[PDB]
């Protein structure tokens, strides 16, 4: 109990921490029920432990919005380290202070509209890729699981997009890329063993299967040699080194986050979009009545069809209400500073619970239903943009954000014009979250697809 | 070898280090030898490796300058961390940025002149004290330790400018504070095992007696609450909380600090003068005969008195161009810099060898030789600001230079007016550095004593 007397002393309540492990064994239920229940019992301000590290929990806008955007180069820049990283430390969704700032700047052009709608010819063929694996494993005539057909969508897209490699990801087992690319009981007591990440960094064990990583390192360094290109991450980055130029070693570490973001979050999504356009035939019918007005005759998706459609969005913007896959926001408190009318000391990891505010009865009604309407153009406006936070908020916001919502709408528009969800026997309903530390369902998503 | 190809890559020269060790195999003999030897092979700017901990030394004056005084706000700000410090992080000479900052401009009015001509009568005090030690060990007639009768003055002269605690410690074997205040195979070990000290933090082994330092904190909040007052180091401390205000364990970090500056410091170079005293009678009469014609007839010391004595400031002046007691000053590079002409990565220790510097035949005449008319009015122009560094340099330099010099001029004259020091049979001519990490004597300067 070396800091654990920080919030009585500062007058802040939260949960009793138990020496060395903190209010980790809170996490029994998981992260978002933690947030849940915090948040209701304590109000709109509360502290814990994990193991000796406190964190400091808020819940006003105005003082979320003092985090996130006007204290962030001043105050709030980084957020916590996290385990045995190694050469990933230079990834800019790790990276501190300047050395973050300079790899924002150098990574901020390649999400603009421009470099997007470029793109859009490219992740277009892979959604009608997307549509022959789903109308085979539609004649299959029995459940289907959305994470594999949504992952092997994700994973073409990402390759594709940061590398220029066209594979079939469904339909090869094992392209090198595939399987490369295809790849808790130890965050944990590295949260309670803090002190022993210097000892893992030293032993070059790194959380990084390093058994993959040197496969990149020589892949984009070949890609490199052998480069009528282009418009790939890669290119985008090879033309950026023609502040400080990038490295060699840096231009794989950004690529590494790339993937982990254009896979895992961007099926993730897609699934909990698919559970609920199932579990409400209402709203995936008046859905694939917009994408035909808008598309009439399964014509092709173009980036300035995807904008036009309003239901869309909306379904998009409310499933990632009940389900933002980040769950929290973090930022580390560099100095000691005073906001909205409360102290923050140094060292102090300010948290704002995503997951708790989206599903807060203080701002939305229902917040267990799944309710396209709330994001519609009339009721849009009482929404405050820092309670609803799926993509963070201020200048270390998601990068990716205009990328990852272009790229889902894609597949969905070309989804829903061939295909209806239906649940099976197979289908959990209702979808229970799982009881770790992604936000993911318990059990994989499967349903029932049928050809239009 | 982790970071053992960093010199080569930039073309600096330096040994080759072995892997984990580094060049730590290099010191068997000792800080000052490894540096005289790389700067004579190498030139004006060569590196090493601490264990995995890269080290460029310099030795250009522009360099030095602009390390420790043009860029040391925004480059050269803090030195290198070092092993389980605990509370005593707080302390100004290990505090890092602004929280160094911070405890700087809290304590630099404590070292004025105006402070310090308050404290002549003090320590003058003392001075008495020491002719009345040594005036038994005279009449013993038989070889006299000096760190011992000088460590129990500059222990008298530290707990009474800083506490007020006025004590005998050569005849008071033990008042509390004397024990308390008296009181490498682990350092080397922390130098190649540096991901340990987080360890031995988490442990609360703290390398600092763990059991004397709780002994100050209640000593000083008891004098807080006890406190015809007074002009110790506490009290201006305690008049500064009346930036931020200090804190009382931050107070206690910082008296903890002057003790260790105080006394092996103070202890340590009149023990390097009296020996150069000795082995050049002529020196030792010359400044006997300006001590009594500026104060003639064994006149008390006074502040404006000891500043005119030139002889006296030559003497202490070439004693710390022999031995430096600091030996290195050392600043950690913050960020990419590019200084005078060649560049500095980020986490590069710059260590400027004052030991090597003022031994080097290309700024002094004789190295070996001490020459007290090195220093003359004449002669002082020709020394470089940059090359003779005893107290450092720039905004971090030593806060209690000031303080040092009028303690030890003090008892220089008090000591020199009734005394007359001679080598015996037991004194060591030459003498020997020690072969370990610290600046002292390899055997304890002893030497005859007589009375005039
Ligand atoms: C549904 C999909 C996605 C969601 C919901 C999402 C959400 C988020 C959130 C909440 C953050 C943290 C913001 C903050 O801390 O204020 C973040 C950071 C980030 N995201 Fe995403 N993201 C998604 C997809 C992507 C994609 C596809 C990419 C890149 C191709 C990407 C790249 C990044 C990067 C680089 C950061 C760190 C930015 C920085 O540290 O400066 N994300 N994302
Ligand atoms: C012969 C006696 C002394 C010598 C030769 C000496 C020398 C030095 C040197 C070379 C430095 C480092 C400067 C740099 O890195 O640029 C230093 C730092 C320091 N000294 Fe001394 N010193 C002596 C006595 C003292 C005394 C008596 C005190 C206090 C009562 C003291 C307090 C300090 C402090 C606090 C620092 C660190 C300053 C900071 O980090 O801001 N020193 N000293």
């Given at each position: 109990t070396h800091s654990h007397g920080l919030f009585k002393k500062l007058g802040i309540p939260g949960p009793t921490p138990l020496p060395f492990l903190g209010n980790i064994l809170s996490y029994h239920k998981g992260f978002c029920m933690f947030d849940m229940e915090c948040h209701k019992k304590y109000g709109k301000v509360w502290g814990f432990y994990d193991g000796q590290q406190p964190v400091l929990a808020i819940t006003d806008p105005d003082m979320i919005k003092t985090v996130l955007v006007k204290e962030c180069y001043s105050v709030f820049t980084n957020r916590r380290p996290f385990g045995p990283v190694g050469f990933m430390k230079s990834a800019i969704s790790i990276a501190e202070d300047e050395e973050w700032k300079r790899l924002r700047s150098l990574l901020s052009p390649t999400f603009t509209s421009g470099k997007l709608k470029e793109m859009v010819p490219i992740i277009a063929q892979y959604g009608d890729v997307l549509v022959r694996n789903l109308r085979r494993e539609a004649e299959t005539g029995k459940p289907?699981?959305?994470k594999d057909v949504f992952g092997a969508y994700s994973m073409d897209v990402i390759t594709s997009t940061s590398?220029?490699?066209?594979?079939?990801?469904?339909?090869?087992?094992?392209?090198?890329?595939?399987?490369?690319?295809?790849?808790?009981?130890?965050?944990?007591?590295?949260?309670?063993?803090?002190?022993?990440?210097?000892?893992?960094?030293?032993?070059?064990?790194?959380?990084?299967?390093?058994?993959?990583?040197?496969?990149?390192?020589?892949?984009?360094?070949?890609?490199?040699?052998?480069?009528?290109?282009?418009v790939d991450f890669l290119q985008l980055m090879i033309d950026s080194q023609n502040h400080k130029a990038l490295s060699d070693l840096e231009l794989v570490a950004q690529s590494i986050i790339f993937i982990f973001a254009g896979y895992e979050t961007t099926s993730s999504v897609l699934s909990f979009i698919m559970y609920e356009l199932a579990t409400h035939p209402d709203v995936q019918q008046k859905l694939?009545?917009?994408?035909?007005?808008?598309?009439?005759?399964?014509?092709?998706?173009?980036?300035?069809?995807?904008?036009?459609?309003?239901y869309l969005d909306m379904v998009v913007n409310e499933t990632l209400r009940?389900?933002?896959i980040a769950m929290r926001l973090e930022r580390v408190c560099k100095k000691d500073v005073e906001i909205n009318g409360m102290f923050?000391?140094?060292?102090?990891?300010?948290?704002?619970?995503?997951y708790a505010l989206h599903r807060d009865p203080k701002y939305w009604t229902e917040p267990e239903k799944f309710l396209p309407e709330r994001f519609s153009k009339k009721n849009k406006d009482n929404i405050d943009p820092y309670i609803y936070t799926p993509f963070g908020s201020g200048p270390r916001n998601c990068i990716g954000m205009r990328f990852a919502l272009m790229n889902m709408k894609l597949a969905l528009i070309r989804v829903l014009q061939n295909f209806s969800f239906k649940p099976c026997k197979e289908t959990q309903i209702p979808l229970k979250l799982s009881l770790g530390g992604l936000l993911q369902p318990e059990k994989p998503v499967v349903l029932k697809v049928e050809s239009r």
């Open positions: 289907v699981t959305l590398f220029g490699v066209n594979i079939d990801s469904l339909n090869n087992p094992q392209d090198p890329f595939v399987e490369n690319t295809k790849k808790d009981p130890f965050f944990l007591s590295i949260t309670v063993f803090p002190f022993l990440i210097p000892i893992l960094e030293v032993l070059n064990i790194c959380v990084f299967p390093r058994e993959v990583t040197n496969f990149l390192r020589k892949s984009v360094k070949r890609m490199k040699e052998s480069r009528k290109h282009r694939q009545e917009e994408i035909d007005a808008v598309l009439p005759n399964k014509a092709p998706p173009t980036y300035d069809t995807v904008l036009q459609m309003e009940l389900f933002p923050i000391p140094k060292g102090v990891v300010v948290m704002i619970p995503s």
